[PDB]
C-alpha cells in the first residue's frame, strides 16, 4: 500500500469488472453519489478485493461505507 | 347480398369462347344450401383426424386418440387449404413414412363435402372430408395383459421399410 | 399336405424369410357369417412397446435422485455460504424502477398475445399434447409410427397437464407470455446493468433492447412451438452464470447447470443453453479453483455432476433407453434427413412442421446481422471501450457465435428459426446501440455508413411478401404481393434511402466530421429500425 | 462446517449414479393382443 | 437476364485458432498478417455471406483449399 499502487490496481479491477476507464476514479467520485455501480455489481469488486488482498470485508461495512474510501481505508487496516 | 331483396328469379349463364381443348366448363342448377356451422354439425364427441396445420383454429373438436396401440376410427378429416394440404400436409403423414393417413385410406373412404367460410366467401379456409367405412364393423375387444417387464431390451425392430 | 409341382423337405411349409414384410393390421375382416367354428383364431400382439409406466423400483429411484440432488444443492448452498454474504433485500434497488419501455414491452406483448400471429406448427404440438393423456407416453402423434417425442421432450407434458383446463388458443399459449415476461424482466433488470454502466445509464440502449426483444419475439415465439422457452432458458442460464461470476458463489452456477440441462431437454434446438453453459467455462473453473482451497475438490464438483444429470430423471421418466433408441432411429430412417430440409425452405413457401423460413431468414438477417456484426467489430477492434464492461459482453457474444456453429448446420438440420435468441439478442442489440452511439464512435463517416447498412438491411427485410402462415393471414395489408406504397415498392424506396446514406457517407469520407445533422439522424438507429418493424407487424 | 461438506459429496454422487441408472431400470409394459 | 465432414471439421480447427491468435496477440511461429487474412476469408465465407443471405445452400465441400490451410494452421 503506497497510496498509488493499490489505487491503480483497484482501477484495473474497476475497468475489468465495471468497465470504467481509470479517469473517473478519484476520492471525490464514488459508487452511488457520483459514479454508477450497483448493489450486486459491487460484490464483484468486493470479492476481487478479498481475492488479491487478504481482507475479509464484513457484510455490513460493505453496504455501510458509501464512498471509495471504503476500499482504501480497509486494505490499509489489517 | 349482391342481389337485392326484390330479386326473385335466377338463371345460370355460361360461355366457352375459347376453342382450345383444355378450355371447357360444366354447370349444375343453382341451390341455396342448408348451412350449418362445423361446431354444430361435428360435435366434440365424433373424433376427427385434424391435420397438423389446423389444430389451433379448431380447439374444441376431440381428435382421434390412441389407447395402447389401437386408435379410434375417425369420422372427419379437417384439413388446411389446398396447396398446403397437397404439398405440405398429406406428404407429412401417410403409410410410407409412419403417418396417420396410412390407417385411414386403407380402411375408410374419404369424400370431400362442401364448406364455406362465413362472410368471407372467396377464401379457402381448408376442407372438411367425411370418412365412412367400407364395411360395417365394431371396435375390437382387445384383451390386454400387463407386466411384461423389461431391462433394456427391445422386443424386435419396428417395421420401417419394405 | 405336400407340394406336387419338388417335395422341398417333408412339408408344404413355404414363405419368405425376410422380417420386413408384415401386415398392416387395421382389423380382421371377413365375409363368412354364422356361429364360429372350432379351431379358428387370428391373434396378433400389437406393438405396445412405448406404452409403459415405471415400476416401484424405478419410481423410487427417480424420487430419490430428485430429492438427493435437491439435498446436495442445499448442502452446496450451505457450503459456499462461508464468505458471510447474506441475501438480504429481495427485489433489489436496481429492480424497482419502472421505465417507459415497460409500457411498450409489457403492454405490447399483451396486445400481440391476444391478436398476434401463431407459429406454423402450433396445431401440431397442441394436437400431440391433447392426446397424450389417454395414450400415456407423449406420442409424436402424426408422423413417426406412434413413436414418442421423447428423446428429450419433457416440455409437452406441461401442455398435456395444461389441457385439463379448457384448451383454447389463449390459455394453452400462456407459457409464451409468462416466458415473455421473465425474459424481459431479466433483460432490463439483471443483464443490462450487468453489461456495464453505459447500457444501463442510457435509455436508447434499453429501448432498443426492448424493441428488438419484441421484434424477434412476435413472429416466432408466440405460437406453441417451444422456442420462447429456449429463449427464457438461455437467458436464465446466462444471468444465473453471471450472478455466480460476480458474487463468487457456486450454487447459482449449479442452478445454471441444471437449467441449461433442463432447457436442453425442451427441444433438440435447445443447444443454445449448453452453449451459454460452455461460454462461461473459464470463470466457473476459476470459481472452483478459488474455493478449492477452503473446501476440497470432491465436495465441490459432486453437486455439479449431481445437478447435471437430473435432466435424465425427467426425460427418462417413462421411456427405457432401448425404447428411446428405437424411437430415435425411426426418425432417422423414414424421417427428414439433413438433405431434405435444405430444398424445402425456398420452393413454394410450404408450411413445414418445426421451422419458419420466410420470416426466420428475414428476421435473422436484420436483428442479428445489423446489430451483431457492428457490435462485434467495434468490440474486438477497440480494445478498451469506455462504458461497456468486457467479459459479460464477450460471453454473450460467445453465446450468439457458438449457437451459430453448434446447432445450426452441424448436428440437426433445422433452417434459421430466429426465435431462439429473441431474449439474448435483445441485450445483444443493446450492446450494438451503445457501440454506434455518438459517445463511442467519433467518426460521422463510420456512423453514416452504418446507417446506410441499416437502411439496406431494412430494404432487404421488406423485399419479400407480407405473408403469415395459415390463419394469421386471413386478412393482411399485402397478402399476396410485395408491400408497396404509392405504386413503387417500399423495398425500392428503402434501397434509395440506403443509397442516399451511402453517398452521404462517401461524401463525408473526403471532407473529414461536423455534428449538426448527423448527430440528430444517426443517434440510436437500432431502436428506430426495430420499432418500425414492430409497428409495421402490429399494424 | 464439516457436516454440510460431507452431505455435498455423499448423496451428491449417489444422486449422480441414481440419475444415470434411471434409463436402465425395470418398466411394466402393458401388452395387448 | 432481368455436411458433417466438410464443415464441422473446418469449424473444429477454426474455433481454436481464432482464440489462440486472440489471446496470444502475436505468435512466434506464424506470421501476423496473412494469417488474419485467411481468417477473414474463412470466417466471412462461413456465414453473413452464405448463411445469413441464404444463397443456394448445400454445396458442401467447397473449402478444399482454404480449409486445408486452416487445418495446417491448426
Ligand atoms: C469441472 C466440472 C465437472 C464442471 C465445470 C465445467 C463447467 C462450469 C461447465 C461444463 C459443463 C458441465 C459443468 C457439465 C457438468 C455435468 C455433466 C457431467 C454433464 C452436464 C452437461 C449439460 C450442460 C447437460 C447434460 C445433458 C445430459 C447429460 C442429458 C441431456 C438429455 C439428452 C438429450 C440425453 C440424450 C439421450 C441419448 C442417449 C441419445 C439421444 C439422441 C440425441 C440427444 C439426439 C439424436 C436424436 C435426434 C437427431 C432427434 C432429432 O430429430 P428431428 O428430425 O429433428 O425431429 C424434429 O422434432 C420436431 C417435431 O415437432 C420436428 O422439428 C422434427 O420432427
Residue numbers in the entry:
A (entry chain C): 3 to 80
B (entry chain A): 921 to 1082
C (entry chain A): 164 to 168, 170 to 676, 678 to 704
D (entry chain A): 23 to 55
E (entry chain B): 488 to 489, 525 to 596
Paper excerpt:
Furthermore, EmbB has been shown to play a key role in forming the characteristic terminal hexarabinofuranosyl motif of AG, which is the template for mycolylation. Together with the other Emb proteins (EmbA and EmbC), EmbB belongs to the glycosyltransferase C (GT-C) superfamily, whose structures comprises an N-terminal transmembrane domain and a C-terminal soluble domain located on the periplasmic side of the membrane. EmbB is observed as a dimer along with an acyl-carrier-protein (AcpM) associated with each protomer, thus forming a heterotetrameric EmbB2-AcpM2 complex. The EmbB protomers in the two states share common structural features which include two periplasmic domains (PDs) and 15 transmembrane helices (TMH) arranged into an approximately crescent-shaped bundle.
In this study, we have determined the structures of a substrate unbound EmbB2-AcpM2 complex in a presumed resting state and a donor DPA-bound pre-catalytic conformation which we define as the “active” state. Most significantly, the two EmbB protomers in the DPA bound complex are asymmetrically associated. Relative to the DPA-bound protomer, the other EmbB protomer is translated by ~16 Å along the dimer interface, and in the plane of the membrane. This change in subunit organization dramatically alters the dimer interface, in which, for instance, the distance between the pair of TMH11 at the interface has halved, resulting in a more compact active site. The whole of the DPA fits into this part of the map with the arabinose moiety and phosphate group fitting into a charged cavity just above the membrane surface. This cavity is bordered by PL2 which contains the catalytically relevant D(285)D(286)x motif; PL5 which is organized as two short α-helices (α5 and α6) and a following loop region; and the mixed α/β subdomain of PDC. For instance, the phosphate group is coordinated in place by R495PL5, while the arabinose moiety forms hydrogen bonds with E313PL2 and Q431PL4 which themselves are further stabilized by N304PL2 and Y320PL2. The last seven prenyl groups of DPA extend to the other half of the hydrophobic groove via extensive hydrophobic interactions with I421TMH7, V438TMH8, I448TMH8, I468TMH9 and I469TMH9 in the membrane space, with the end of the tail interacting with F670TM14 from the other EmbB protomer. Another structural rearrangement upon DPA binding, by comparing the structures of the two states, involves α6 in PL5, a short α helix that interacts with DPA, whereas in the resting state, this region is disordered. The DPA bound EmbB2-AcpM2 structure in this study represents an intermediate state before C1 of DPA reaches the optimal position for catalysis.
